[PDB]
Structures are given as C-alpha cells and as structure tokens.
Design a protein around this ligand. Structure first.
Ligand SMILES: Cc1cc(C(=O)Nc2ccc(N)cc2)co1
Lengths: 237, 300
C-alpha cells in the first residue's frame, strides 16, 4: 500500500528498498522568441533514486539529447525514468535488488509497473508523504555534475556522508529531509545557514559540511526555525 | 419455429426467454415456450419468487437437439434436459400445443433486437467458455466467477473467458513498454485477433456473450470482461474500419437494451468516459456516443 506517517519506520528495516523521484528529470527554461512567442529550452536533469537505509544514491543524469525530436516530453519523462530504474535493478546482483520501489509521484506507478513486469516480486508503491527530494539540485555538488555532463551518465553518491558512523538511518533520513525541506522553502537562507562559519568545510568526498554532533544540533534547530517562520507567514499567524 | 416444453412449474418463478420475461404462479398450468426463432442462440432463465438471489439460466440452440425444462425438488431448480427420443418429444409438444398451455415467443416483426445482440455469438464458442461437454446447452448464474477472477476457486464451475490484462508480458513487448501501453494496437491486432481469436467475429461473439451474462444474471466477471474488450479496441490507434463500424452498432443495441435501473451497477464510468472522450476511437462511435449521452448523461 501507500507509504505514510504511520508505516514510516519500515524505511529503516533490513528489506532492501529504493525511493525514486522524477521531479528533476525533464527541466526547462521558458523564454521569448524573436517574434514574441514563448519557447522552452531543455537543460540536463537527473533521476533521484535513493536507498534510505544506506544513503546510497544512484544519480542517473539525463542529458538533453535524449529529448531530441520527441513529442509529449513530460509524459515521455515518466517512461524514461521507469526505463532507467529498470535497467538499474537489472544491473544489480540479485541479492542487491530491491524488494520495494517507492515512487514519490503517483504518475510514475504505471510506467514503472510496466517496465518491471519481469520482476513480479518487486512491489511498486506510492506514498502520501510530501518529501522534498526535488530540492536535490540545490546541493551544489549534485547540481554541478548534472550541469557539466555531456553524455548520459550514472554517478554514485552517499547522501548521508559519514553520518551513519554516529547516528541511525532513521536519524540520518530525518536530518536529510529537514535540510532538503529547508532548501526547498528558502534556498538562500538554507545555504547561508550551512556555510556561514568558514571553518567548517565540506570534504572532497562529501556533500555536506563536517559538523560535529553539537554543531548538527544547532544547525538542525536553525533549519527548523527557518521552516517555521515561512509557515509563520504563509498562513498569517 | 421451435419449442421448449416444461414438464410442470411447481414453484413460483419469473421465467425469461431472451428479453421477454413472464410470471408463473406456484403450480400454474404452464408447459413451456413455443414459436422460438430458429437460427439464433437463446437463453431461458429463472428467478424464484422466494429468492431473488441466484438468477440462473441455460444458453441453447434449438438446432442442436430437443430440449425441455423440468423442476428438480432435490436440487431446487429448473433444469434443462435433452430428449433423445424424438418421437416422444414431438408427441409431448403437440399435446401441449393442442391444449394451449404454452406461451408464444413474442417477437414483433419489425424488431431486430435479439439478432443485433447475438449476431456473432455461437453455441460452439459458448460451450468452450462454459465447459460441460456432456450437455449441448450451457448453464450460467449470478455467482459464477471467471478464470481471471480465480487467478486473483472451483475451476469446473467457472467462465473461461479470454484473459486480457493490460499490464502483462503478453500485452507489452520488451522494448516497446511505453508504446504498447499507450497504444494497444499490437495486443489487439496481433496477440488477440490474429493469435487467440483468429478473426473479429469470434472477438465480437465473446464480447456479446459477456454483455448478455452481465445484463441477465449480473455476473460481475462477465461485466468486467465486456468492458475490458471494449477498452482494448478503444485504446488501439489502429483498428480496421469495419471493426469500428460494427463495434458502434453492437454497443448501440447493448445500451439500448440495458435496463435503466441496472445502469449504475452494469456501466463502468471510467471505461465509458475514456472510450467516448479520450481514446483514439473517441470520434469513431457516433451511434453509441449519441445514445449514451441522451440516455445516461449522469454517467458522463
Ligand atoms: C442483479 C440483477 C438483476 C438483473 C436482471 O434481472 N436482469 C435482466 C433481466 C431481464 C431482462 N430482460 C433484462 C435484464 C440483472 O442484474
């Protein structure tokens, strides 16, 4: 069934699972033409596929060439996503294949189900959660590899850096989602928060700064405040 | 013209013969139905006055034998049987006609309804869907489940309709996942028409037989099958022009005949709105769309 607030710890058990998010797969800028009409120009995108227990992220880069000469791109994007996720599963040894794939938008269920007909034992699930994975292109290093790509490409990351050496996957996923929610609500502020103190750096093999335990508490509180405050103004408290 | 005599009518029952239905009282002197048109299949069917639950009935063709109905008080139902002694059968029928204890199949001469509803239905194909090879006629009732329904429990008493599943390897060619799911022409034309049904007549015959079992017995799996087969055509971009035109005629009579008060349980809102308004064939069912919009605009 659908994933929601009540079956939330299931993400962190020992059944292999992936989140797939397609919100950054087909990306465009809208502009005016010389004749005063409007036109889009596509830019590179990415499939965001994440194992919430290990942090492993499989970032499939979608180069703009894949849209050349195609119609109904928004619809093709969902099928392209399903095609790539299916190739990913097939590339993995059986014992690493997921038992579930949770899609963050219901429009993806049918494209993924059809592409996964060969894996009847892999459950394709929606979710009721409003997860912020769309803000993944606000993470500087992820944006940079997507925009620099000149051909299709898969890049592998650990989106929790080394956090699991000190925190549980439940705590890690809660941190990640707070950081991404913050980045989605107010990117500038969220980023100022993360980098204000220039003495806390991002290792070359990491995505986020090397905060201490106590510094993460302060950071986490600052991201909660920022998220609070636009709920303190969007519904006129 | 042919006759189906009844040994007697011991229990109060509503009897149906195709679209005509009449009330018979407990031990009324009723001895059968005469003047039944030769050349078509037929369905006789019963609803006991005591138990509106379980409408059931028998498909048959009068060319395949002499058939009669007889109540069984152990099993509690009107049973169809075959009389092999042809002299005995003519003698019985004649006596009952002379004494005028038979109702007449009441066909108006202008009316092509039954033909239009059974055009492609053949007894030989019915007997393959309803497996019971020792009888020339076929029993159906409200509760019988389909082969696809049993996959999702008694396989002997099932409706073996052709399985259609839009999210199946059969439906979907590797490497055309998107193309084949959004435009089912491959599944319709190659898998089903050329592969399984052989021709569109056989396809239409199963479709009419599914509708008829849905309408007369409220056989839920039959209704599911009818909508599936309509949807497979409507969701195919490439359909022979002769099939489209015939499909519009088929559906038209089905909707014309469908009882108005069972339209909420026998019509699937989603399938119809999709077929009439979104599908490739949204402009190809003029008669069906015209009758649907004047009779059931609530569904749309
Ligand atoms: C539950 C349910 C009852 C019936 C029904 O009675 N059908 C029917 C019967 C006779 C005619 N002419 C036409 C239709 C269908 O479903």
């Amino acid at each position: 069934g659908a994933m929601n607030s009540s079956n939330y710890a299931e993400l962190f058990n020992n059944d292999i699972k992936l989140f797939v998010d397609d919100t950054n797969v087909y990306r465009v800028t809208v502009h005016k033409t010389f004749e005063g009409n409007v036109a889009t120009k596509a830019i590179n995108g990415c499939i965001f596929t994440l194992n919430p227990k290990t942090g492993h992220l499989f970032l499939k880069i979608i180069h703009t060439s894949v849209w050349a000469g195609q119609k109904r791109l928004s619809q093709l994007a969902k099928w392209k996503t399903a095609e790539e996720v299916s190739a990913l599963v097939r590339s993995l040894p059986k014992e690493e294949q997921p038992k579930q794939i949770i899609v963050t938008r219901k429009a993806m269920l049918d494209p993924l189900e059809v592409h996964m007909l060969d894996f009847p034992n892999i459950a394709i699930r929606p979710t009721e959660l409003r997860l912020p994975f769309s803000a993944a292109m606000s993470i500087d290093k992820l944006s940079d590899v997507v925009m620099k790509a000149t051909e299709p490409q898969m890049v592998l990351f650990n989106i929790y850096d080394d956090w699991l050496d000190r925190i549980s996957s439940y705590t890690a996923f809660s941190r990640l989602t707070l950081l991404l929610r913050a980045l989605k609500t107010n990117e500038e502020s969220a980023k100022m928060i993360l980098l204000s103190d220039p003495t806390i750096t991002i290792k070359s093999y990491h995505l986020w700064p090397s905060f201490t335990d106590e510094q993460w508490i302060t950071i986490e509180s600052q991201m909660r405040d920022l998220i609070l405050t636009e709920y303190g103004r969007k519904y006129n408290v | 013209m042919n006759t189906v005599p009844f040994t007697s009518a011991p229990i109060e029952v509503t009897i149906g013969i195709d679209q005509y239905s009449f009330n018979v009282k407990e031990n009324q002197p009723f001895h059968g139905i005469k003047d039944i048109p030769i050349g078509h299949v037929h369905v006789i069917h019963f609803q006991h006055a005591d138990n509106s639950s379980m409408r059931y009935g028998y498909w048959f063709d009068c060319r395949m034998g002499n058939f009669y109905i007889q109540y069984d008080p152990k099993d509690g139902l009107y049973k169809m049987m075959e009389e092999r002694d042809g002299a005995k059968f003519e003698n019985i029928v004649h006596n009952f006609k002379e004494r005028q204890m038979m109702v007449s199949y009441p066909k108006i001469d202008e009316d092509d309804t039954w033909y239009n509803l059974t055009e492609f239905v053949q007894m030989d194909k019915i007997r393959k869907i309803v497996r019971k090879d020792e009888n020339q006629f076929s029993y159906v009732d409200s509760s019988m489940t389909t082969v696809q329904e049993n996959e999702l429990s008694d396989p002997a008493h099932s409706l073996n309709y052709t399985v259609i599943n839009f999210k199946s390897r059969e439906a979907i060619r590797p490497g055309h996942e998107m193309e084949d799911f959004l435009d089912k022409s491959y599944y319709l034309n190659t898998v089903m028409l050329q592969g399984i049904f052989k021709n569109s007549s056989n396809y239409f015959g199963e479709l009419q037989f599914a509708f008829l079992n849905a309408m007369f017995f409220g056989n839920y799996g039959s209704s599911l099958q009818w909508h599936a087969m309509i949807e497979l055509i409507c969701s195919s971009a490439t359909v022979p022009k002769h099939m489209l035109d015939k499909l519009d005629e088929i559906l038209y009579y089905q909707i014309k005949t469908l009882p108005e008060q069972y339209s909420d349980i026998l019509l699937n809102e989603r399938v119809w709105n999709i077929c009439l308004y979104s599908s490739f064939q949204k402009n190809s069912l003029h008669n069906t769309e015209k009758i649907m919009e004047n009779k059931y605009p609530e569904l749309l």
